[PDB]
PDB file of C-alpha atoms and ligand atoms in Angstrom:
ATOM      1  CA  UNK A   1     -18.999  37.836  21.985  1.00 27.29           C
ATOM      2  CA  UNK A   2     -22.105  35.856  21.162  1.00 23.01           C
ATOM      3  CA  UNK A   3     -24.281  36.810  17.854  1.00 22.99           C
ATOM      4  CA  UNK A   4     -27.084  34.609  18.547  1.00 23.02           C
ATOM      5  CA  UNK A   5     -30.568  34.697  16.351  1.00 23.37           C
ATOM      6  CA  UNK A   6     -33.323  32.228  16.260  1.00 20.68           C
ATOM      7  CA  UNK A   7     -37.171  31.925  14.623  1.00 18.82           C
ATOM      8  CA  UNK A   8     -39.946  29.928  15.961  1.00 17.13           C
ATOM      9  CA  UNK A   9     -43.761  29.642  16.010  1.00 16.76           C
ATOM     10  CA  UNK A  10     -45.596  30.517  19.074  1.00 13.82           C
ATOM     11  CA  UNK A  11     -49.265  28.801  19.471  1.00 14.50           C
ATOM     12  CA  UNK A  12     -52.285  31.275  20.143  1.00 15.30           C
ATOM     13  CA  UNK A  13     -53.038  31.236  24.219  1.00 15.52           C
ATOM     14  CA  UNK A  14     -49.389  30.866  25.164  1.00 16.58           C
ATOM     15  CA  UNK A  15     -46.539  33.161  26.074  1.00 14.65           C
ATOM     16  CA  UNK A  16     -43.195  31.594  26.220  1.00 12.24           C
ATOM     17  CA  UNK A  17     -40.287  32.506  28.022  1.00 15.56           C
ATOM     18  CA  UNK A  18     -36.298  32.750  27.438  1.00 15.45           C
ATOM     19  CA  UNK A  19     -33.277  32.785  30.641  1.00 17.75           C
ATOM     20  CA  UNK A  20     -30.099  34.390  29.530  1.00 19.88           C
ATOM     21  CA  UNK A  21     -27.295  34.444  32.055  1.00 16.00           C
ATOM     22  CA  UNK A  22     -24.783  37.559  32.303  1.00 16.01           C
ATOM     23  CA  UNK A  23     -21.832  38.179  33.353  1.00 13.19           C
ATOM     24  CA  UNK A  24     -21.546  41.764  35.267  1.00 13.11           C
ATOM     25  CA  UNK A  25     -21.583  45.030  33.493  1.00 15.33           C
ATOM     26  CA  UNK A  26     -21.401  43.233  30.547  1.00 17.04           C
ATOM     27  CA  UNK A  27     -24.037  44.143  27.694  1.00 14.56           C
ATOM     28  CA  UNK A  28     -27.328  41.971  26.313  1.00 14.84           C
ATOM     29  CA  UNK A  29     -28.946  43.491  23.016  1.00 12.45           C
ATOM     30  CA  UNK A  30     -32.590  41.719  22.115  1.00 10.95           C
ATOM     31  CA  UNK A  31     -34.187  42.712  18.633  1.00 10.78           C
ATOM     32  CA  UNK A  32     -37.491  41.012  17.828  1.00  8.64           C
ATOM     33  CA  UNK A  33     -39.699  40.634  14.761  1.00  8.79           C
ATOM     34  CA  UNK A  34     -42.739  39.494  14.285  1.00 13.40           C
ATOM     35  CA  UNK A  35     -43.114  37.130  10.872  1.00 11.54           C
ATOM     36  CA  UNK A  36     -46.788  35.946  10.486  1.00 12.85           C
ATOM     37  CA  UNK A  37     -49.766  35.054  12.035  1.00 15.32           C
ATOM     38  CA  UNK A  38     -52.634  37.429  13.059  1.00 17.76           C
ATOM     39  CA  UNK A  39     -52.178  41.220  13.349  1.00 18.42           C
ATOM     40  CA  UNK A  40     -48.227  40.513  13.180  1.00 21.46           C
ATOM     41  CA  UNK A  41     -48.498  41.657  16.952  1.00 23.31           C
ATOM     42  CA  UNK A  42     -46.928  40.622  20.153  1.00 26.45           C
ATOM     43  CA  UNK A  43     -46.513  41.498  23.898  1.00 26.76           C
ATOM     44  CA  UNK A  44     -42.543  41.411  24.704  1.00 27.42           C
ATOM     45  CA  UNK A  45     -41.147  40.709  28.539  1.00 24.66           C
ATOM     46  CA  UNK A  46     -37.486  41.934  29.936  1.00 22.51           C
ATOM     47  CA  UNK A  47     -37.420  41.322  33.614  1.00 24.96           C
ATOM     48  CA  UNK A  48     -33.499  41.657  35.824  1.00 26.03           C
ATOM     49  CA  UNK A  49     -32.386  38.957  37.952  1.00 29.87           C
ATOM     50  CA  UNK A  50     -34.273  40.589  40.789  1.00 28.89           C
ATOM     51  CA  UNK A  51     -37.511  40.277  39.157  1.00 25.52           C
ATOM     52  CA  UNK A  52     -37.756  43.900  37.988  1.00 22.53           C
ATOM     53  CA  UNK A  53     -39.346  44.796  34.550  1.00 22.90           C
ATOM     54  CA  UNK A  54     -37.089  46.374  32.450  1.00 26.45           C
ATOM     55  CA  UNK A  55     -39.031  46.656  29.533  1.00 27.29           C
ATOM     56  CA  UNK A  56     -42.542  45.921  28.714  1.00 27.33           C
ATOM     57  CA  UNK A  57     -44.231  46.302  25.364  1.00 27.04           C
ATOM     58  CA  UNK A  58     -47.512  45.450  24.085  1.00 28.54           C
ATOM     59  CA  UNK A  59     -49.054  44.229  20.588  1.00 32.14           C
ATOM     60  CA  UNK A  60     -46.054  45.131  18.904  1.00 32.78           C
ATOM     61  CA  UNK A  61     -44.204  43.751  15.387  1.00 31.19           C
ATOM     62  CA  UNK A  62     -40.624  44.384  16.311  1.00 31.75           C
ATOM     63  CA  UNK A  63     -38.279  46.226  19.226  1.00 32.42           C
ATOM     64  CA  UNK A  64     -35.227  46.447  19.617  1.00 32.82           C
ATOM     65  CA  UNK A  65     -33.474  46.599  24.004  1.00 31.05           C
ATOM     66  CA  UNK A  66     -30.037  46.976  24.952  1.00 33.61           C
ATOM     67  CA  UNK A  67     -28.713  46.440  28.523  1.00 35.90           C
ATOM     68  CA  UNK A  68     -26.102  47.577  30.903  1.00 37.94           C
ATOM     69  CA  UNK A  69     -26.260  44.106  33.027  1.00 37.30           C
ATOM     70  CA  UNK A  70     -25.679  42.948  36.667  1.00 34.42           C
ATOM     71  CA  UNK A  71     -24.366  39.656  36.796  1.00 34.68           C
ATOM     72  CA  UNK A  72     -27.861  37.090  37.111  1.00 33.13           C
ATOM     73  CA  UNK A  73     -30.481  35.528  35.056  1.00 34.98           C
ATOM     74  CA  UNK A  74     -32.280  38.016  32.632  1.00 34.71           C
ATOM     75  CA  UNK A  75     -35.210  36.649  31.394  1.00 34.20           C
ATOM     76  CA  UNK A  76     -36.855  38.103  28.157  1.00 35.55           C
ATOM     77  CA  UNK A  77     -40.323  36.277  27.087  1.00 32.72           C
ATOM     78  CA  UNK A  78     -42.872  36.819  24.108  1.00 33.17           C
ATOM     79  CA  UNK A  79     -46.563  36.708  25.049  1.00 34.75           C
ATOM     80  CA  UNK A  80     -49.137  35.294  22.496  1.00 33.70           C
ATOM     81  CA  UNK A  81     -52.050  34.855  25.426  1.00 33.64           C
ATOM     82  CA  UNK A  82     -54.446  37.096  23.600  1.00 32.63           C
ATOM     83  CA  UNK A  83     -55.215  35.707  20.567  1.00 30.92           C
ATOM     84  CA  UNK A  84     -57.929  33.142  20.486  1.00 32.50           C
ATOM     85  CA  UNK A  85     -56.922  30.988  16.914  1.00 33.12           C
ATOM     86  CA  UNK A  86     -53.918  33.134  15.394  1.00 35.26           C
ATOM     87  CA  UNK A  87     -50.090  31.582  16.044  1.00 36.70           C
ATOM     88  CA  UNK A  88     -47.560  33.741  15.639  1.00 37.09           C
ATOM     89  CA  UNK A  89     -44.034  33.612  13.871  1.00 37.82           C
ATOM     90  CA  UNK A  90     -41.159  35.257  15.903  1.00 40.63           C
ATOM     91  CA  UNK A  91     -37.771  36.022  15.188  1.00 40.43           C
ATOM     92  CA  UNK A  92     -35.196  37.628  17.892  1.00 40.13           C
ATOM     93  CA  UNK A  93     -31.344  37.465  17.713  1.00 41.09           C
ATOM     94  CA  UNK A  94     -29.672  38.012  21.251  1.00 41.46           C
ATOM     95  CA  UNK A  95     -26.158  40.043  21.302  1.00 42.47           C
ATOM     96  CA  UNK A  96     -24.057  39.377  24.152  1.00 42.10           C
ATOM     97  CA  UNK A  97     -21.060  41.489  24.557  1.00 45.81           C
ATOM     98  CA  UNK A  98     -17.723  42.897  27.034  1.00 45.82           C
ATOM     99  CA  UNK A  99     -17.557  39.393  28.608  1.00 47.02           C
ATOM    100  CA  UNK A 100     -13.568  39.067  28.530  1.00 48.28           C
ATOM    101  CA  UNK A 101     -11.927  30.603  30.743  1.00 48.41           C
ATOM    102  CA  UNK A 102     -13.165  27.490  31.530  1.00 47.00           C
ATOM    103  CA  UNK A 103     -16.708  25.442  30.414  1.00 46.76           C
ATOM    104  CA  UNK A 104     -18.602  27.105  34.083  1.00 44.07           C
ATOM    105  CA  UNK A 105     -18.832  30.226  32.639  1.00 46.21           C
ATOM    106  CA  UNK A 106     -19.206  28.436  29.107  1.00 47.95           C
ATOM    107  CA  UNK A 107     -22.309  26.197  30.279  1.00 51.47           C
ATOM    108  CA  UNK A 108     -23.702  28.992  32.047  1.00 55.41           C
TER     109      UNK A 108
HETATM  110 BR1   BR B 201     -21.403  34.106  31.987  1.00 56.36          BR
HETATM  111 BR1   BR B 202     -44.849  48.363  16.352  1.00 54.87          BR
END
């Protein structure tokens, strides 16, 4: 499907925000770890295409979320808006999966 993993740094104050589309009843897997900065903590966001929280976690160092999707934009985030000074160093990797033809549903 799509093994997908990525690390970045997240300034203190700010929470930052990912959009994944899905295709229906397919199946989005999120695993998280915080790296550095601070207490190695962080607030993590799942929300459906509806706007419904699916999972919400927070001042955590690592989770791991799998889905059973409906065919819209998930959005999962990472939230750094409570530390004053301390960055933070995150690394996720996003599983997509039972997906089963042209660059529409590539692109999007
Ligand atoms: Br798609
Ligand atoms: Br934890």
């Amino acid at each position: 499907g799509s093994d997908s993993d990525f690390t970045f740094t997240l300034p203190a104050g700010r929470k930052e925000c990912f959009y994944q589309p899905m295709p229906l009843k397919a199946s989005l897997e999120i695993e998280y770890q915080v790296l550095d900065g601070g207490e190695l903590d962080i607030d993590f966001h799942l929300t459906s295409p509806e706007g419904r929280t699916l999972v919400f976690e927070q001042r955590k160092s690592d989770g791991v979320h799998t889905i059973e999707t409906e065919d819209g934009d998930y959005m999962f985030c990472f939230d750094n808006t409570f530390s004053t000074i301390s960055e933070k160093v995150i690394f996720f990797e996003l599983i997509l999966d039972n997906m089963g033809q042209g660059q529409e549903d590539w692109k999007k």
